[PDB]
Amino acid sequence: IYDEPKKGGLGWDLDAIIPFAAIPENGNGLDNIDSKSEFAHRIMLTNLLRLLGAVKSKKTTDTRPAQCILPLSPNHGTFGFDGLYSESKISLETLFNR
Amino acid sequence: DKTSIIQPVSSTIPSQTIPFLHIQKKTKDGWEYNKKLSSLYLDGLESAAINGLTFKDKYVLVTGAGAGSIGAEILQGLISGGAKVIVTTSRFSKKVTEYYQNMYARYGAAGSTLIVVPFNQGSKQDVDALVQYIYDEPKKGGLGWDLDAIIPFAAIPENGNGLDNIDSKSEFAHRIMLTNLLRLLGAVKSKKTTDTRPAQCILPLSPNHGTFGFDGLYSESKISLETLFNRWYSEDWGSKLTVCGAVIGWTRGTGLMSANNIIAEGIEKLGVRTFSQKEMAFNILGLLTPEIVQLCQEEPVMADLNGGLQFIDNLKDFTSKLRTDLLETADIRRAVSIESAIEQKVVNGDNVDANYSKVMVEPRANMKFDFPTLKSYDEIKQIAPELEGMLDLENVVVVTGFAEVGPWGNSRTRWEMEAYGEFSLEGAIEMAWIMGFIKYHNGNLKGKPYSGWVDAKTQTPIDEKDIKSKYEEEILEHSGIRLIEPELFNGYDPKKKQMIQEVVVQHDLEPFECSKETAEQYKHEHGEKCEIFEIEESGEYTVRILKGATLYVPKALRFDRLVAGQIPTGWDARTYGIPEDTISQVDPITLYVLVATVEALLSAGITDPYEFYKYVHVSEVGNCSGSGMGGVSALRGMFKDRYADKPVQNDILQESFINTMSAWVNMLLLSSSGPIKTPVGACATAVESVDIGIETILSGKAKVVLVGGYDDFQEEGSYEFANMNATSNSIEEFKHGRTPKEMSRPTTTTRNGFMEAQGSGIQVIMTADLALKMGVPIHAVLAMTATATDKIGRSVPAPGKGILTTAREHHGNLKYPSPLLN
Amino acid sequence: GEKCEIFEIEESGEYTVRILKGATLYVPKALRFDRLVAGQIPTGWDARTY
Amino acid sequence: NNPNELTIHFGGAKGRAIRDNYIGMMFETIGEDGALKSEKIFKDIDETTTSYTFVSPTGLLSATQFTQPALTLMEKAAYEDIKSK
Amino acid sequence: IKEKEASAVLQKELDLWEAEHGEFYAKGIQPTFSALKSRTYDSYWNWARQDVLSMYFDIIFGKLTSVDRETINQCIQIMNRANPTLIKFMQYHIDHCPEYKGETYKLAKRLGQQLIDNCKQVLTEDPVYKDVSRITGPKTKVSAKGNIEYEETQKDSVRKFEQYVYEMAQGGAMT
Amino acid sequence: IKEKEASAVLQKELDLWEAEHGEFYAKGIQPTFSALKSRTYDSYWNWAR
Amino acid sequence: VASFHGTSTVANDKNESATINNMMKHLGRSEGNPVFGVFQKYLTGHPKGAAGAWMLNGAIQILESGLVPGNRNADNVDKLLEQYEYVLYPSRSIQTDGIKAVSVTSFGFGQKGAQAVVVHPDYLFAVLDRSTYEEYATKVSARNKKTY
Ligand SMILES: NC(=O)c1ccc[n+]([C@@H]2O[C@H](COP(=O)([O-])OP(=O)(O)OC[C@H]3O[C@@H](n4cnc5c(N)ncnc54)[C@H](OP(=O)(O)O)[C@@H]3O)[C@@H](O)[C@H]2O)c1
């Protein structure tokens, strides 16, 4: 995205990011956090933050900030068996302080 | 001990004031300070303060309790109360487990049990196996435990990994702290079966969710831990687990993030409070009072131990400017000092400023010999009342000297490494001297005259202090029980113990040339199964082995016992002065016995052996010492070496003996004619020699007698001790993670056999009055000595209680006590 | 060391081994010794008799 | 799996909802006073005891309070299976 | 050639893991737990007699005066392990503690008598955790030369946890 | 024999990853992005008509 | 003290304690006056022949200084040994105020065990009058400098 067309990039400069991708994981209660759950946590948090930590690095000018949009949720473990969906979506709030 | 508090602290809470340690309660709006719960919590804490807690029959798992960490401080709390704790170390070494052992010996309340286990929280497979090892039965190797409380604190110091530099260390830390911590609970739940014993989790929450700077995924890890509260309702394990979240505040502790101990004094000036590690331990142990316990068993409990720091806006900026001003005073007070120092050094000149620096004193070593300190006579009449004129001096044996050569050097450098675990300065240059690290060079050294200690490898002068700081690592690395170093044993490599295999040839070999009589012997010892043919141009024969002959192929096999208490690597007799001839001739163990005997006599204040003959006749200086199986190096030579026809000393058999050592002693030092005897009690042989010494002296047969033992470790002896299953297997000690220096474990619940070593030991015992007539140091008084044969059996290795008979007596009726004791 | 080779017999699981040039072997031999006399215990002595 | 000891646990709600049953067991042994002393069986169980343990060196299946329920169950089981036929 | 390329296959498999996860993660997930390495620590019944003794001489050698807090800490630690044999072990020692040899012996005999009487009560009573160590707070000063030293000195107003809790009661909402 | 055991070494290496992470995770982390597969959609001027 | 043979084996470590306990029982040790166990084999190993000599030097050095070494590998004392009341198993060096006498028991193959007892040198010096002690002290001093 940030590389030049002469190198195959796009010359773009992201004004807004909408990282919504997520996995349907279900029935994985607290005791059955399985590989699908760790993969989902990776997709939703520990790789989502890496995407932003990359886009920041690719930026050089401080006049064009990239407004992130973060698909938060009001249900932090208030529902039943969804695996690591909670401590994924809730860890996204730390950015505000960060 | 059980006072009684009437005025609960709950009444001391100032009106509408939030305490420093308050419980929070959830409402539809969220969490907020509840006065009732927090008042209760504080009351339990005060009771714990003046009376204390009890965790009898509390089964706890504690994780991430490294030394100098919070988790280590609640261990002292759990054990002191009577817990049943599982511990875990991300890394397991000797210093770790011994630290835990010191803790358990200093706070191991009766009933309490500790368990140290290696466990990495980063592995799905470590967590799978750990709870199994906890919840499985002893008959399957488990523990039969059932965790009442979990304290999963383990975490990684990750720092400087900002948002853009979330690296592999960050993902690993997130795994340790959240996505593997939850798996631990999801496992413990599965292992549970009864809903009457819920496991109170303790969750090290934090009040700073990304409010600090660059810590990587620390935030969205610790903050994802709060979802459990809602999940305790949403999911099904409400009764298996009860969550009890703690929000640990500013801990002025080590590791973790202690990176800030310097600004604690600063921020405490806002009326906010930090905590020491013991204080934070207390604050959390309060979460185990039997009433908080119940409270958790129906409600997830948020506990805010953050000491009010949450009332500081932009605490990040506050701490940053505090540390900034601290550094800005530090550096300017440093630089202005430097400037005014150099300004003076210019004005006053650099010729007097060196005179302001005081001429400090370098320390040397002061190796004395220091005979045991004599108390004054009248003083000794107080230790002992009227024992005077009672004993016949001529019939009291007294050890006047002693010495050793053991894996810790002489008797001094062993006693020090024993009673002190660390070498003093003198006891360090000595171990250097006998290990061949330093050599007292004298004369001119690179032009300059020199009389002092010098390195042995590069031969450069070294002060007496750099001895320790420079060699202490190596000395402790190459001395005492360690893995066997082959260069001390002629290439005996336990990993490649050599053996020969009886093998029958199937195809005649290629004819090779050999000598005349060798060919003749080959023919005579192989029969027609070989051929010999002379080379008329050489006279020496060719020989071809034919099909059907028996060959002996070499082979090796990985052996187990890779540890033995070698003599300090680098020990050499030349350092003592044994002539190179004798060195080249006799068995190594004789060297040990001689170097022991000389300094034993020295320890007796004897410079030259002949001094005895000034007060005693030549036929009254005996040597009742002897080995257990001494000479193994020569027994090997005469049995397994000659069979190979390796070039072997001709008269080896004169050293293979056991009296041949005392022979060399008399031949080289005493030249006496006293009673030579020689016991063999292989294990208990140096004590029976003392009994012989006494029955000798009291008989008047001799007035001085060397008495001691000695033996040498070698291959064939070790292998056969192994096949008897006597020495502890080294491989099985390393599967058990026992480091070499600690698998010699007397009286230990998990002992597994002994660890053999080499060396010698000598004592110059002597009649009493002759001792105090020569004026020698009476080091001791051998009162009693005996030996015994145990009982009829069919197994030599099994001991028995025969030695008990030294104390048997008669107890029929004591109305008339024996007047002879008065 | 490399001075020999080992190879499994898949039909047996037990290996073949070939020694290579340069290895050290141990050939048996005998030599006529001198001391042919010693005061043996009476030939035929046996403890079972006791 | 007849063990040698059994530890009852009064855990959360239903854990307390059991130890109260044990507490409620009040038997009578007419002493020298003769008074109908509604006295407690388990003086070791109270509002504080979190968990109680039984011990039988031979095996719990030999303790009278556990063996005779096992016997009456096995006997009634056999009888009912027979009556089913 | 066959294993040489199949090995390349599993290599092009394995390098994917490290490329996606990075080194430190791969080095850290190395499972290390082995039930054989456990270390159970039980024999309190012996450490109790060890510690009684170690105190008995530390007292007479003046390395622990009665006013200290650590002596009381470990006396609590002692009575947290009292056994009917511990009482006898201490009792004999106190009986034969020779007073005429000096003054510290009197201190030792008397403190021992006190501890004996106490363990005779707390005997059969449940072990208790009662920390007595002195409360300490931070105190970071910079040297007059300019060196930053961090000292965790004792509080003067807050010395027992009995006082620490009252201090925690006064809180920071009204600071 | 040499590659047959070194392959066993890297196998005892690789199986650790899957044992600690499990299958689905290993199957899901298979990187799939390739700049060559982009599809730019521009020609609005034609879709309009 | 009782300088134990203590060869970290299964049978030895229990048999030795059994004998010490029983013999201190038969002689009527004052109850609650156990003897300490020092186990040099933890540190030096087991010098299959000369074990007694190392143990005896240990005993004499103890008699001199008054210190008592400890098994610094005393991980966890075996449960069975709690029944032997008349013994103690230190794991930490404890400098005492003085030791009267030390036992040294050592066990061998084929049931040749043995036991030595080393009483403090001081109790010897008290059998003899003043003049002899003082005169001996002078010669000792001289020998000490010469040996130094
Ligand atoms: N102290 C504070 O101010 C503070 C503030 C907020 C939260 N907390 C929480 O309280 C806990 C205490 O931490 P701390 O900062 O006081 O000390 P720390 O330096 O965080 O302690 C780390 C401990 O965790 C263990 N550990 C490290 N890596 C591990 C791994 N990969 N697997 C298993 N165990 C591992 C170590 O034990 P071994 O050395 O035995 O391996 C070590 O002793 C933390 O877990 C943290 O979440 C503390």
Is B96 an 8 Å CB contact of chain G? no
Task: State the Cα–Cα distance between residues B716 and B636, nearest whole angstrom.
Answer: 8
Task: State the Cα–Cα distance between residues B594 and B592, nearest whole angstrom.
Answer: 5
Task: State the Cα–Cα distance between residues B83 and B514, nearest whole angstrom.
Answer: 78
In DSSP terms, B709 is beta-bridged to B761
Task: List subunits contacting chain C, requiring 3 or more Cβ pairs under 8 Å.
Answer: B
Contact B749, G76 (CB under 8 A): yes
- Which positions ≥6 away from B154 have C-beta within 8 Å? B63, B64, B71, B88, B90, B121, B176, B177
Task: State the Cα–Cα distance between residues B667 and B654, nearest whole angstrom.
Answer: 14
Distance between the two ends of chain D, CA-based, in angstroms?
A: 30
Q: How close B771 comes to chain G (CA, Å)?
A: 9
The string of DSSP codes covering B708-722 is EEEE---HHHHHHHH
Q: Which tokens is A6 given?
A: 């002469």
The string of DSSP codes covering E18-82 is HHHH-HHHHHH------GGG-EEE--HHHHHHHHHHHHHHHHHTTSS-TTSHHHHHHHHHHHTT-
| Tokens 């487990």 -> residue | B97
Task: State the Cα–Cα distance between residues E134 and E164, nearest whole angstrom.
Answer: 10
Contact B32, B25 (CB under 8 A): yes
A61: left (phi over 0), alpha (psi -120 to 50) or beta: beta
Looking at residue B643, its amino acid is Y
Identify the residue whose C-alpha is closest to ligand 1 atom 48: B248
Looking at residue D59, its amino acid is G
Looking at residue E99, its amino acid is E
Neighbours of G100 (CB within 10 A): 12
Q: Which residue numbers come right before each break in chain F (C to N over 2.5 Å)? A: none
Strands G101-106 and G113-119: antiparallel
Is B738 an 8 Å CB contact of chain G? no
Neighbours of B95 (CB within 10 A): 9
Task: State the Cα–Cα distance between residues A31 and A28, nearest whole angstrom.
Answer: 7
Query: Exposed (0-12), middle (13-18) or buried (19+): which is B651, by Cβ within 10 Å?
Result: exposed
Check CB contact under 8 Å for B552 and C32. no
Task: State the Cα–Cα distance between residues B537 and B769, nearest whole angstrom.
Answer: 80
As a whole number of Å, the CA-based R_g of chain A is: 16
Is B124 an 8 Å CB contact of chain F? yes
Task: State the Cα–Cα distance between residues A66 and A44, nearest whole angstrom.
Answer: 19
- List all residues whose CB is within 6 A of at least one atom of ligand 1: B 64, 66, 69-71, 89-91, 120-122, 153-157, 176, 204, 206, 248, 251, 253, 255-257
Q: SS3 letters for C35-48?
A: CCCCCCCCCCCCHH
Task: State the Cα–Cα distance between residues B92 and B117, nearest whole angstrom.
Answer: 8
| Tokens 């080499």 -> residue | B758
Distance B215 CA to ligand 1 centre (A): 14
Is E144 an 8 Å CB contact of chain B? yes
Check CB contact under 8 Å for D12 and B195. yes
- Strands of B232-353, DSSP E: 241-247, 301-304
Task: State the Cα–Cα distance between residues E9 and E5, nearest whole angstrom.
Answer: 6
Backbone angles phi, psi at B242, to 5 degrees: -125, 120
**A78-82 contacts, C-beta under 8 A, 24 or more apart:** A78/B230, A78/B233, A78/B234, A79/B234, A80/A29, A80/B234, A80/B235, A81/A26, A81/A27, A81/A28, A81/A29, A81/A30, A81/A32, A81/B234, A81/B235, A82/A25, A82/A26, A82/A28
Task: State the Cα–Cα distance between residues G5 and B403, nearest whole angstrom.
Answer: 19
Check CB contact under 8 Å for D12 and B242. yes
Q: How close B129 comes to chain D (CA, Å)?
A: 25
Ligand 1 atom with least separation from CA of B120: 32
Task: List subunits contacting chain B, requiring 3 or more Cβ pairs under 8 Å.
Answer: A, C, D, E, F, G
Q: Which tokens is G100 given?
A: 């009267």
Task: State the Cα–Cα distance between residues D41 and B746, nearest whole angstrom.
Answer: 48
Q: How close F49 comes to chain B (CA, Å)?
A: 45
Q: Which tokens is B410 given?
A: 């002489």
- Which positions ≥6 away from B295 have C-beta within 8 Å? B37, B40, B301
Q: How close G32 comes to chain B (CA, Å)?
A: 19
Chains E and F touch, using 3 or more CB pairs below 8 Å: yes
Neighbours of B25 (CB within 10 A): 16
Neighbours of C18 (CB within 10 A): 8
Size (chain B), residues:
822
Residue D46: give the domain boundaries.
4-58
Contact B625, B662 (CB under 8 A): yes
Contact B119, B176 (CB under 8 A): no
Looking at residue B528, its amino acid is E
Contact G61, B415 (CB under 8 A): yes
Contact B54, B285 (CB under 8 A): no
DSSP three-state, residue B331: helix
Task: State the Cα–Cα distance between residues B603 and B594, nearest whole angstrom.
Answer: 14
Task: State the Cα–Cα distance between residues B317 and B211, nearest whole angstrom.
Answer: 10
Strands B530-534 and B541-545: antiparallel
Residues from chain E contacting residue B259 (CB–CB below 8 Å): none
Identify the residue whose C-alpha is closest to ligand 1 atom 13: B256
B to G CB pairs, distance under 8 Å: 403
Annotated active-site positions of G, please? 5, 46
Q: Which tokens is E14 given?
A: 């394995």
C-alpha distances out from residue A64 to A5, A16, A98, B84, Å: 20, 10, 19, 59
- Which positions ≥6 away from D72 have C-beta within 8 Å? none
Task: State the Cα–Cα distance between residues E47 and B214, nearest whole angstrom.
Answer: 46
Contact residues of F toward E, CB < 8 A:
3-4, 6-7, 10-11, 13-14, 16-17, 20, 26, 29-31
Task: State the Cα–Cα distance between residues B636 and F12, nearest whole angstrom.
Answer: 44
Neighbours of B537 (CB within 10 A): 6
Contact B196, B297 (CB under 8 A): no
C-alpha distances out from residue E122 to B120, B217, D75, E49, E55, Å: 40, 49, 50, 17, 19
Task: State the Cα–Cα distance between residues G102 and G3, nearest whole angstrom.
Answer: 7
DSSP three-state, residue B655: coil
Rounded (5°) CA angle B82-B87-B88? 175
As a whole number of Å, the CA-based R_g of chain C is: 23
Picking from B759, B617, B763, B627, the residue whose alpha carbon sits closest to that of residue B693 is: B763
Q: How close F21 comes to chain A (CA, Å)?
A: 6
Task: State the Cα–Cα distance between residues G93 and E9, nearest whole angstrom.
Answer: 60
Contact residues of A toward B, CB < 8 A:
29-33, 37-38, 41, 45-46, 49-50, 52-54, 56-57, 75-81, 84, 86-88, 90-98
Q: Helix B426-434 to helix B466-475 angle, to the nearest 10 degrees?
A: 60
C-alpha distances out from residue B450 to B356, B434, B460, Å: 30, 21, 11
Size (chain A), residues:
98
DSSP three-state, residue B132: helix
> Would you say the C-alpha torsion A73, A79, A85, A87 has a positive or negative sign?
positive
Q: Which of B201, B514, B624, B683 is catalytic?
A: B683
Contact B680, B658 (CB under 8 A): yes
Neighbours of B129 (CB within 10 A): 18
C-alpha distances out from residue B298 to B194, B291, B292, D26, E15, Å: 17, 11, 10, 29, 49
Picking from B685, B741, B593, the residue whose alpha carbon sits closest to that of residue G5 is: B685
Task: State the Cα–Cα distance between residues B822 and B817, nearest whole angstrom.
Answer: 10
- Alpha carbon dihedral D32, D33, D36, D39, in 10-degree steps, equals -70
Picking from B623, B622, B625, B638, the residue whose alpha carbon sits closest to that of residue B587 is: B638
Neighbours of E105 (CB within 10 A): 16
Is G21 an 8 Å CB contact of chain B? no
Rounded (5°) CA angle B476-B479-B480? 105
Q: How close E36 comes to chain B (CA, Å)?
A: 5
Task: State the Cα–Cα distance between residues B454 and B406, nearest whole angstrom.
Answer: 25
Contact E169, B9 (CB under 8 A): yes
In chain D, DSSP finds a helix count (H) and a strand count (E) of: 2, 4
In DSSP terms, B406 is beta-bridged to B409
Contact A84, B179 (CB under 8 A): yes
Task: State the Cα–Cα distance between residues A55 and A58, nearest whole angstrom.
Answer: 5
Ligand 1 atom with least separation from CA of B208: 6
Picking from B691, B258, B602, the residue whose alpha carbon sits closest to that of residue G52 is: B691
Alpha helices in chain A (DSSP H): 35-41, 48-58, 85-89, 94-97
Residues from chain B contacting residue C35 (CB–CB below 8 Å): none
Task: State the Cα–Cα distance between residues B408 and B405, nearest whole angstrom.
Answer: 8
B210: left (phi over 0), alpha (psi -120 to 50) or beta: left
Picking from B327, B415, B330, B405, the residue whose alpha carbon sits closest to that of residue B370 is: B415
Distance B153 CA to ligand 1 centre (A): 6
CATH code for the domain of D33? 6.10.60.10
Testing ligand 1's pocket by substitution, the residue of B61, B62, B63, B70 carrying the most ligand atoms inside 8 A of its CB is B70
Task: State the Cα–Cα distance between residues B804 and B819, nearest whole angstrom.
Answer: 25
B715: left (phi over 0), alpha (psi -120 to 50) or beta: alpha
Contact B455, B464 (CB under 8 A): no
Summarize chain E as % helix, strand, coil (round to 5): 60, 10, 35
Is A2 an 8 Å CB contact of chain F? no
Task: State the Cα–Cα distance between residues G88 and E92, nearest whole angstrom.
Answer: 15
| Tokens 């796009």 -> residue | A10
Identify the residue whose C-alpha is closest to ligand 1 atom 25: B64
| Tokens 């001529």 -> residue | B394
**Among partner residues E10, E13, E29, which is closest to F20 by beta-carbon distance?**
E29
Testing ligand 1's pocket by substitution, the residue of B61, B69, B178 carrying the most ligand atoms inside 8 A of its CB is B69
Query: Exposed (0-12), middle (13-18) or buried (19+): which is E106, by Cβ within 10 Å?
Result: middle
Task: State the Cα–Cα distance between residues B810 and B817, nearest whole angstrom.
Answer: 11
Contact B505, B524 (CB under 8 A): no
Contact D46, B230 (CB under 8 A): no
- Maximum distance among all alpha carbons in chain A? 51
In DSSP terms, G47 is beta-bridged to B757
List, edge to edge, every strand of the sheet that includes B512-513: B512-513, B541-545, B530-534
Chains A and F touch, using 3 or more CB pairs below 8 Å: yes
Distance between the two ends of chain F, CA-based, in angstroms?
A: 70
Task: State the Cα–Cα distance between residues B17 and E169, nearest whole angstrom.
Answer: 9
C-alpha distances out from residue B203 to B89, B200, B229, B304, D23, Å: 18, 10, 11, 12, 35
Check CB contact under 8 Å for A90 and B226. yes
Residues from chain B contacting residue D9 (CB–CB below 8 Å): 194, 196-197
Task: State the Cα–Cα distance between residues B639 and B626, nearest whole angstrom.
Answer: 22
The string of DSSP codes covering B739-788 is -GGG---TTBTT---B-EE-EEEEEEEEBHHHHHHHT-----EEEEEEEE
Residues from chain F contacting residue E29 (CB–CB below 8 Å): 16-17, 20
Task: State the Cα–Cα distance between residues B314 and B257, nearest whole angstrom.
Answer: 19
Task: State the Cα–Cα distance between residues F21 and G37, nearest whole angstrom.
Answer: 51
Task: State the Cα–Cα distance between residues B412 and B433, nearest whole angstrom.
Answer: 13
Q: Which tokens is C36 given?
A: 């042919």
DSSP three-state, residue B483: strand
Chains B and F touch, using 3 or more CB pairs below 8 Å: yes
As a whole number of Å, the CA-based R_g of chain D is: 17
State the DSSP H helix or E strand holding residue G104, giving kind and residue range, or none if neither: strand G101-106
Cα atoms in the Cβ-side hemisphere of radius 13 Å centred on B4: 1
Q: Which tokens is B157 given?
A: 């110091």
In chain G, which residue's Cα lies nearest the Cα of E55? G94
Identify the residue whose C-alpha is closest to ligand 1 atom 14: B256
Measured in whole angstroms, how far is the alpha carbon of residue B127 from the centre of its chain?
Answer: 29
Backbone angles phi, psi at E112, to 5 degrees: -65, -45
DSSP three-state, residue B624: coil
Is F29 an 8 Å CB contact of chain B? no
Task: State the Cα–Cα distance between residues B301 and B297, nearest whole angstrom.
Answer: 9
> Would you say the C-alpha torsion B432, B437, B439, B444 has a positive or negative sign?
negative
Looking at residue B246, its amino acid is A
